[PDB]
Design a protein around this ligand. Structure first.
Ligand code: K
Ligand code: K
Lengths: 290, 292
């Protein structure tokens, strides 16, 4: 992974990145450029953009902060990169994703190819129905509002040795990329925050998956939303204290001690799903909660 | 592969053990014999050797499926056929050797009751096809697969791949026992189906013929069990696809199309796998969410 930049900037990879970003649709960035204007924009400035990326002279535009009304009356915050930056981010992620997919845990389902929130629900249900119905529900503060940039780029540097890639990735951190949490409202759609930041979140949170796997804990995780499932409150209280302490001391993330809870499946809301026990089928099941 | 001696793999100690563990893990309602899933191990300890002897000699008689009416989240009832836990155990043992065979034949846009696949994946694939411009929905509605499928036609199709006569025999008998598709997924419910783990595979085998025909015609589609939607770019193209595919489904597959509920529609009027659809003008894309 010494010279990944030319792979990212290859004719095939950029052509695939353009087509994918056009298919993604999504709202506009601060420049107001819609997805239909990207082809003409790249036909005129594409080579200039490639040259700036090669020399670390490309200036990413700041993400546009938008407020999207939620179906429960509330509002959610979203940062929308320009369609040019979403194009570049997709080009970077097309190269970084195959590298990091072999590292990732099978119970991580957020923003990964061929994975979705419904799989996380069914996997959690199978674990609950095995007798692990004491839920350690650790609530984390927003990942990109709390993650340390230098700590995140250092961890990425353990796998990615191309300095030019490290540079452009860091510049996108400061641009304000974040995690589109539309999935929490049970809405199925294409995320609008670009295709780089969720991978960056999975890289850091993969450290939590590895720690939980070493401790033999059963879990599922979707982006920064994880639940751990154990067989008793005794083990649930111990896991709650050990994992939260690991998240803050080793990962540098922030645990919301007010929203975090030890619970049973009946009172659990996860990824927009509610859980209930079916006495006819003799099993816990899930469905979208109101 | 060589499918002439599959019954030996079905009745092997490891396959039956994995089948027993999976069925106990699935739990589910009881069959006509009233035997609970916690009573299977004792039952197999006593009669397991006899059962496999009967299965080896085509002398095992499956019990009929227990017909149950399940109330739905809001409104009417739901018909469900529950095999006995013993028959669920044998069906799982059969499916464990047949599923890897047919997984090599199945279309990538078939998502019902398949390993590492779920309804949300069908929704997202459909959304991507709609957002590419194919937002005219051919919403063909099929009568219940196992209420209309011809048993001879289905077994003849299975025999094209499976050459083991003992497997063909026990699978046909399970068709007669009344296995069917647990359509709990239509209510957006995520959970373990109760209709056994053999009938969904058998329905996918027959409907795989529909997938190959649609792929041959260059049609964009997603399918979940017997619930399929086809997406085209115009209404005139939607009417011709509706007439051609419905005729193919009935004349070439022997299944029955409900002409009343089938319709050519737009995404906003589509209810599919418990999801409704709508266009987001700020994101410039169709999206989906659980309908009321
Ligand atoms: K959580
Ligand atoms: K349909």
């Amino acid at each position: 992974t010494s010279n990944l930049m030319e792979q990212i900037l290859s004719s095939d990879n950029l052509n695939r990145a353009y087509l994918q970003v056009v298919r993604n649709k999504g709202a506009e960035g601060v420049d107001g450029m819609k997805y239909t204007e990207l082809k003409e924009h790249l036909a005129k400035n594409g080579e200039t953009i490639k040259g700036q990326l090669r020399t670390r002279k490309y200036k990413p535009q700041p993400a546009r902060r938008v407020e999207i009304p939620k179906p429960d009356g509330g509002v959610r915050n979203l940062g929308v990169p320009t369609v040019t930056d979403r194009f570049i981010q997709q080009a970077i992620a097309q190269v970084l994703t195959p590298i990091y997919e072999e590292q990732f845990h099978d119970h991580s389902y957020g923003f990964r190819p061929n994975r979705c929130a419904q799989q996380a629900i069914l996997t959690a249900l199978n674990i609950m129905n095995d007798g692990n119905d004491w839920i350690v529900d650790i609530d984390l503060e927003k990942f990109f509002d709390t993650v340390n940039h230098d700590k995140l780029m250092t961890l990425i540097g353990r796998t990615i040795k191309d300095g030019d890639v490290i540079s452009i990735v860091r510049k996108y951190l400061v641009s304000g990329i974040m995690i589109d949490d539309e999935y929490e409202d049970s809405i199925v759609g294409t995320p609008q925050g670009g295709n780089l930041s969720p991978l960056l979140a999975n890289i850091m949170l993969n450290e939590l998956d590895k720690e939980m796997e070493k401790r033999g804990l059963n879990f599922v995780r979707y982006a920064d939303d994880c639940i751990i499932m154990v067989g008793s409150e005794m083990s649930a209280n111990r896991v709650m204290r050990n994992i939260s302490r690991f998240i803050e001391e080793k990962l540098g993330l922030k645990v919301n001690m007010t929203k975090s809870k030890v619970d049973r499946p009946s009172g659990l809301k996860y990824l927009g799903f509610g859980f209930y026990f079916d006495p006819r089928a003799h099993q816990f099941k899930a469905k979208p909660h109101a």
